[PDB]
A paper describes a structure:
More recently, the activation of human Vγ9/Vδ2 T cells has been linked to [name].
The juxtaposition of B30.2 domain variable loop residues forms the specific binding interface. The [name] B30.2 domain structure has also been presented by Sandstrom et al., who identified a credible pocket implicated in binding pAg ligand, characterized by a cluster of positively charged residues. In particular, the indole of W391 may form a hydrogen bond with phosphates in the bound ligand. Binding of HMB-PP and IPP to the [name] B30.2 domain was investigated by ITC. HMB-PP was found to bind with an affinity of 1.1 μM and IPP with an affinity of 672 μM, values that are similar to those reported and that help explain the 1000- to 10,000-fold difference in bioactivity of the two molecules on human γδ T cells.
Numbering used by the authors:
A (entry chain A), B (entry chain A): 18 to 205
């Protein structure tokens, strides 16, 4: 619509046209043909363990990273009960486990158990949201170091990582743990 | 709050610090000492009929006009039953009546009879709003020729005048017709 959110987002942030990178996706994940959506398999599929593939975390990256400027993309979470989204550094550990935290180069928030919204921080912070979002705007300002999440239907705030001193390229990152009927999808 | 509306308005538009100009105010209007608020008198007060004073329309202007750039200010309408706000050209007719319309250099919207939201256009357009606003953001982009009005509490759209070819300086303008307990006030 013509809400200040919808009208101004592109005046202020360049719209990322985020395409999921199948080379990065944990083998338990399915990337849609159009590369906009991700689902989970009952079992890991048989894929190479090429270096760019997350082999433990149920993660997938966008094809393109950012090293400067202002950028946004939107994700339809719909009625999923579990998801995490945000950005991560190019050089995160993709083989084995590391805690997904800003100290290990992940800046993400999401939902677990249907209704626990949280930042993936050390320690985890609980978010109290006016309503459950269906669509989440993810907003990067590389130079000020701000990663902001909004409800993309009413423009309400969800969370901001403030004043981070990024020194790596940053990828859109997505994680799904659960096997559910609703996918996680990028709006183009 | 940290809504996209509140966070982004100042990144994109310079906040006007709009002060009411008592020299411009129809003598039936009272301008507050702090020059942020306007009320109506039962009767016209005794004032000079200096050239900058609106002598028929129950109008008052901001002290400063714009000839370029992006600007905004916010107005608390509260539970008033009647008000109109927007911008007008420096050279509007201030002595006698002219219809307040874009053709006569007024770009305004507002409320009449408690619940008829309308643009002051020829002909008048009725606005259907999700909810009655309490605070209205007024947004000027001189070069693209856009004057946009938002609900300043949830960032929802109210109205836009699109692609106007301004060639005069533009003043914030305000009009109140009714005698009611609630004033019309500028947020600083």
């Amino acid at each position: 619509r013509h809400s200040a959110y919808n009208e101004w987002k592109k005046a202020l942030f360049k719209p990322a046209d985020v395409i999921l990178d199948p080379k990065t996706a944990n083998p338990i994940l399915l990337v849609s043909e159009d590369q906009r959506s991700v689902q989970r398999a009952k079992e890991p599929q048989d894929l190479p363990d090429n270096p760019e593939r997350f082999n433990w975390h149920y993660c997938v990256l966008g094809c393109e990273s950012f090293i400067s400027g202002r950028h946004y993309w939107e994700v339809e979470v719909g009625d999923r009960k579990e998801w995490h989204i945000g950005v991560c550094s190019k050089n995160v550990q993709r083989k084995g486990w590391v805690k997904m935290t800003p100290e290990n180069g992940f800046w993400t928030m999401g939902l677990t158990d249907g209704n626990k919204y949280r930042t993936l921080t050390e320690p985890r912070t609980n978010l109290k949201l006016p309503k459950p979002p269906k669509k989440v705007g993810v907003f990067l300002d590389y130079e000020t170091g701000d990663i902001s999440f909004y409800n993309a239907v009413d423009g309400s705030h969800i969370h901001t990582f403030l004043d981070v001193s990024f020194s790596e390229a940053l990828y859109p990152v997505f994680r799904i743990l659960t096997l559910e009927p609703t996918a996680l999808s990028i709006c183009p």
